[PDB]
């Protein structure tokens, strides 16, 4: 009695939301469902519809991704994910991932993203665990900087949401080349990102921008937070929650910083969602007051296993042929030859013998650098069958930049 | 009328040993002392004496680290630091240093290491936080590991102390050359190390010492562990502290794990001083469920820099040169060619051009493989001479396998 | 101060304001709409000072399921409050006075109340006869044992009017078997219903599930609001539920199941639920299910040998009540009781008593849910002939415990 | 191999209890391993040793329980049961359940009961939760009682446990037959009850003894509680702590109440193990401030099923057959025939039409009083099979006391 279909119009669309946010357990925002729908492709959100609702929903939006080296290669940021809880554990998910999986691979994506609510949920589809982020904290009056961090000679000015949108995108657009695991924003994306939206007001406060000039006037970085104002039982007790801080030289980006951490009234502060490896943690003078709170961030799906393993580069030189057990897509199985490194990668079917074994999970897991394939061998999830072909292998998939999570989706 | 003196004899170490205590605003611990002395060189154990007693302290271990790529090396394993609340802020601490950075060097130690507690003390004087540690912990019921992960066909028992350290030497120095940052523990080490100290007891529970045997018969895996039994309102609530679990092959880890995990009546495990990359991490089938707070460990002071470089491995091929400042012993400054591998490494003096500006602080920082000199380069806070230089020197710096907190000192 | 009634709309709207800001709250609009149409503005007294209420008492007409499953008249005691400038000044008193002469005109036979504080009622012959059950527990702890049948029912989320054509025969069905259940017309489904601004706050948008047999037949339902949250590990949602109920033990279980293996929730939460509520049993670890009790309902006896002739005894008893009723001292005398499962009779005797007792305690009695053995073992009933109060206390038991009515 | 066998001697007896508490997650406790061995046969105490120790336990104490209507019958009291982690989840448990329910059906007991750690343990076995127990707390200040009830003229001591053993004993007996569930107190358990253990000590404080004495110096009342010192931001907070409070008559036991209720410096009073239907619940004026949470207590497993139910009194007249099932003991099921009353019981295996089909464990369940046969049926878990039989059974299998807890085993 169910079919499977997608959005076909805009009041599907909205009765489609509508059913996500309450398997979510959510009253469904408006703000949110509103300007999310300018990036939406209908065609791309697929779902179960039993004639009266829907009852499942799974979706994708078209983005790009920063992969190690630095190219933008088109991705699939699945979203919308649900299924209601009267027709759950009847395998609709799983019905739902076959069907995008294949549309992923049609649509010439190489591989696809997601944040999990459950991260056991995904694995027994292809997707591991790539990319970690951390919750970093502290008190700001024990983050005092090492004595030689510059500042350099740069201003900064509190601005509007319209005023921000006019630099922050070059600025963004600069810097994450060198950070995979960010995406590309279209103005649309940047709507989102910036909207005050009224849940995230109720914990801390109304969004604010910070936009860091140098001394010839150019924007070279930025910051997005939102207070919340406190008192103690001695004086002002405020908590800043940080969205991002991005700046174009190490001056920018600790000046901002700074600019933070100084302010009035201001005692505690948080950056959900930081690299492992974020510039802050090293900048200040006592490692440990800045909290690191490390869990999963992004999923990899290999849609496309040779040209996704072609399309990012390597910390170093690597030759290794790949036997990738794909359980969910077993047409993806094969036995894969990886030539690779800081200039150049290729990869294809070969009948050479295999150096390591893997399942297209940890294939994935492994993919952005953020997960050491030598650990995932030590663990004996991933099978060295050539000496030391792991060491290399592992070294040549690490990067010397951690990925970290884009923006939510 | 202070007094720059080695440890005389047995009742001066009492002493010295009380003064240390005290400024940690502690009793001192009657067993823990009577242990350490079976290991400690009273003429490496220095301090401040003002006639009637000790008003600082700073002393070494002689111990063995293991580097990326396996060598296990000299180092002096820093301890027992402090100055009274009467006499801080005077420079005491600075003049220790002074005195035990060269007794370091007569030594033939290339390095020197310690825990801090707290981080910002030793940066002044060369040390970089090196190694990061892990605190794991979650509900064990959520702790379930993902279907393809082998327990094998091994066999627990609960054993004594000296039943333990029959079999558990003999595993651990099969398994660190694998785990840099990890330390030799002779008899006397492991003495301490297994001590079932009162102070922990209070926290937790007495000791106890898990072996795991291969169906052969053979030793390949162990556990330290105390319990903290417990009970809440709707059943019994009970928690294990992990101290340590190693396994020589994935399946005694696996399964020593757990066996911890699916202990009865506990609902709870924490494991302190894990590694960032600790394969348990990786074998949960939901990652979010072990939480990870990550936190500096150790430090590392380069006391022999060239000396140092040559006696790790590098994860890829370099070829780099590097301008290095040692503020606090600037008879280390110098220009250094570093020239390195998987199967070499040589550094010497050089008067062709720098790569790389940093200061000696920031190159203890990379050399376990613990931070990346690119993020500390994009943090300002290392300095890139010659384009690309940094990309290829901050992949050889790193390793495969995160380097990982000793058993404390 | 004049002790009158509400006289019209807007007088009732004053008369709702008083009382909430007794209770320290804002006057909520949503409740005094809906609560409008049950409310006989004749059964709402009150003290008036000239320039607004200072004191309130209410009742509404209601049906009360009696042990074996008689569905009598009850005064549903509501609104009671006195202004905090007009309190210790014996305002409630005299209301009470009041009400209970009124309910005893319109024939009903006993009041019901919940109480903000128990202590305040007994000085008026109210006793506690039914108490409830906080019910709560980690979702992921709460299996049901390996014989619990779910049979071959589904469940859908509906409207509350989809809701609203089916829930109230389930409701009806079932009720004669749950003493201290009260009957509700549409009027009362809807205040039961309402998506109150209040609890939306505390949880979320209220929720109505219906369960249906294989062969389309409605035969179970849920009313449950849920509570997003997340942890330092995943998620944490809460289910907060307010009812559930199913004409048939698969139903029952189906429609629990349904609620535990919800996605994301790790808690749920059954305020007001039976001290034996089936869930209790269902559960293959006992105390996975917190159970937390408290008093629910008091019971005010009006006309006593009605009352006692109206319901039905789990057992014969054939004994004499010396009953004492300190505040309406008309109803004191002496009663014998005759009665079992199939027959009820109370009548004024002279014969010898066997057991002496206030009518605050036959009121607690009165429901099967404190027996009259362990007040005597308190002291508080006394027996005049060995073995009495055994076998009454026996006979004023009941097999199924009663439980709280939806709230007044 | 592993052996199953009783204890040996008193040094076998150290090593067992050892191992219960250990796999208690508890050091074990000397002063109640001493005092606890006096009631001990080591005949009725089996485990498995695997020659090096014992790797687990279950035993039972000959024990006598007080039934509705007031017969005191011998009881099988289980006790120490435990399997060691290293052995857990291999059917030892359920292998010494087998031999511990022979052994009790042939000594002669007619029933088994226990507390369970976890309750879902023991119903695969037979074992029905029977009776639950309520921890009463609230304010003292909060718990004045209704003005009719009489204190009486009786007199309070503080006494040692010598004065108070000298006394107790007799109340206790006198006052056990109106209040099924509880047990038979020999000298030996009434040490074990009032030991001043070191673990309660910690929580709260010694143990102290009250009598209650009538005006012709009988003593008709007695106390056990522990103090728990403590101060507030307003003035003091102290606690008391009961563990048990009993009186001859209405009297003596609300007058031992206010005595405790009336303590200076004590707000706050907590007694665990109540009865659901204990009757300071009543006494109190105000019903909710006295806080009432209620869980499991004892479970009854009925071995010789015509004999427990012959040797029970019941509420109200019954005539009832029983189909019962009886899974771990087979050889229990059959149809049987009840006919019971105030006065009279009698059962035995009939051809008769049944009227109720049950497990055993719901059986047990009801045993007592304290779960209702029509709730069961109601529930789904017992099937009426001739209208109306449900009715007049549960009624009669009901008891106008509440069963309650017994001492701790
Ligand atoms: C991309 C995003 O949108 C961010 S991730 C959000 C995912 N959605 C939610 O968390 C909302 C609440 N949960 C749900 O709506 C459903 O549980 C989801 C997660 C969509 C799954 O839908 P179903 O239709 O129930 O999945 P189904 O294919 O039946 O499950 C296939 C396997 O996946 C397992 N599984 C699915 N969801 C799981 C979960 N939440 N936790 C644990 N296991 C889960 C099922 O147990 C089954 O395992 P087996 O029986 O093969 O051993
Ligand atoms: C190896 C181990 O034993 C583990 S680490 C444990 C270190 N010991 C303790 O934490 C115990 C309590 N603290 C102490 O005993 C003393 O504060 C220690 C940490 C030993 C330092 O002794 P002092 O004699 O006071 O150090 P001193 O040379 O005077 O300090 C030189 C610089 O180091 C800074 N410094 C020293 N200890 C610091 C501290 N704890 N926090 C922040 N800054 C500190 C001083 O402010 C000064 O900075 P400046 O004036 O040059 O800008
Ligand atoms: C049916 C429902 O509406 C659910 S029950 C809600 C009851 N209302 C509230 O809790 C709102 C806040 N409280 C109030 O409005 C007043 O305190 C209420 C409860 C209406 C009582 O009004 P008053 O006019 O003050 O009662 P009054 O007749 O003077 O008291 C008669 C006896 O009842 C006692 N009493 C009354 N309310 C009490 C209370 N809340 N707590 C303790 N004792 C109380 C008085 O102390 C007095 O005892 P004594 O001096 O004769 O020994
Ligand atoms: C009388 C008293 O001493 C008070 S009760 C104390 C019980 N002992 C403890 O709690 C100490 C900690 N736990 C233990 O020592 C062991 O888990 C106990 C409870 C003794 C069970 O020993 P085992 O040897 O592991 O039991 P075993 O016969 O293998 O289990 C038979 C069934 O009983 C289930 N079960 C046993 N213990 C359980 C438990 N603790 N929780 C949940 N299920 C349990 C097992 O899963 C198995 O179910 P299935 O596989 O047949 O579906
Ligand atoms: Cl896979
Ligand atoms: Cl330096
Ligand atoms: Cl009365
Ligand atoms: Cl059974
Ligand atoms: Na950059
Ligand atoms: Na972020
Ligand atoms: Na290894
Ligand atoms: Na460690
Ligand atoms: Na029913
Ligand atoms: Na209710
Ligand atoms: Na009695
Ligand atoms: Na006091
Ligand atoms: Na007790």
């Given at each position: 009695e169910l079919t499977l279909?997608?959005?076909?119009?805009?009041?599907?669309?909205?009765?489609?939301?509508?059913?996500?946010?309450?398997?979510?357990?959510?009253?469904?925002?408006?703000?949110?469902?509103?300007?999310?729908?300018?990036?939406?492709?209908?065609?791309?959100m697929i779902g179960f519809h039993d004639g009266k609702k829907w009852?499942?929903?799974?979706?994708?939006?078209?983005?790009?991704?920063?992969?190690?080296?630095?190219?933008?290669?088109?991705?699939?940021?699945?979203?919308?994910?649900?299924v209601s809880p009267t027709h759950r554990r009847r395998g609709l998910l799983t019905t739902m991932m076959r069907h995008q999986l294949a549309d992923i691979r049609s649509?010439?994506?190489?591989?696809?993203?997601?944040?999990?609510?459950?991260?056991?949920?995904?694995?027994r589809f292809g997707y591991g665990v790539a990319t970690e982020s951390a919750e970093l904290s502290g008190q700001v009056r024990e983050l005092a900087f090492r004595p030689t961090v510059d500042l350099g000679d740069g201003t900064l000015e509190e601005v509007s949401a319209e005023t921000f949108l006019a630099?922050?995108?070059?600025?963004?657009?600069?810097v994450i080349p060198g950070l995979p695991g960010?995406?590309?924003?279209?103005p649309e994306?940047?709507?989102?990102?910036?909207?005050?939206?009224?849940?995230?007001?109720?914990?801390?406060?109304?969004?604010?921008?910070?936009?860091?000039?140098?001394?010839?006037?150019?924007?070279?970085?930025?910051?997005?937070?939102?207070?919340?104002?406190?008192?103690?039982?001695?004086?002002?007790?405020?908590?800043?929650?940080?969205?991002?801080?991005?700046?174009?030289?190490?001056?920018?980006?600790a000046r901002?910083?700074?600019?933070?951490?100084?302010m009035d009234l201001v005692r505690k502060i948080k950056y959900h969602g930081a690299s492992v490896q974020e510039e802050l943690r090293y900048l200040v003078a006592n490692h440990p007051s800045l909290e690191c709170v490390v869990s999963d961030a992004?999923?990899?799906?290999?849609?496309?296993?040779?040209?996704?393993?072609?399309?990012?580069?390597?910390a170093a030189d690597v030759d290794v042929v790949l036997e990738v057990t794909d359980d969910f897509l077993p047409e993806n199985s094969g036995r894969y030859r990886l030539r690779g490194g800081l200039d150049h990668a290729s990869c294809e079917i070969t009948t050479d013998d295999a150096d390591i074994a893997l399942t297209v999970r940890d294939l994935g897991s492994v993919y952005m650098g953020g997960v050491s394939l030598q650990v995932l061998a030590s663990a004996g999830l991933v099978t060295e069958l050539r000496a030391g072909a792991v060491q290399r292998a592992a070294t040549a998939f690490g990067w010397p930049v951690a990925p970290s999570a884009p923006d939510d989706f």
């Open positions: 279909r997608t959005i076909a119009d805009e009041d599907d669309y909205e009765s489609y939301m509508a059913s996500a946010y309450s398997v979510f357990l959510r009253d469904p925002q408006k703000d949110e469902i509103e300007v999310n729908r300018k990036f939406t492709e209908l065609d791309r009852v499942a929903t799974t979706g994708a939006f078209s983005r790009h991704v920063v992969l190690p080296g630095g190219a933008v290669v088109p991705v699939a940021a699945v979203t919308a994910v649900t649509r010439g994506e190489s591989l696809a993203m997601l944040f999990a609510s459950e991260a056991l949920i995904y694995g630099s922050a995108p070059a600025i963004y657009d600069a960010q995406m590309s924003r279209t994306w940047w709507a989102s990102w910036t909207l005050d939206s009224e849940e995230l007001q109720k914990e801390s406060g109304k969004v604010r921008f910070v936009l860091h000039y140098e001394s010839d006037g150019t924007a070279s970085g930025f910051a997005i937070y939102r207070p919340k104002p406190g008192w103690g039982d001695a004086g002002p007790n405020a908590e800043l929650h940080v969205q991002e801080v991005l700046g174009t030289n190490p001056r920018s980006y901002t910083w700074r600019y933070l951490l100084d992004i999923q990899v799906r290999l849609v496309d296993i040779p040209r996704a393993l072609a399309q990012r580069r390597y």
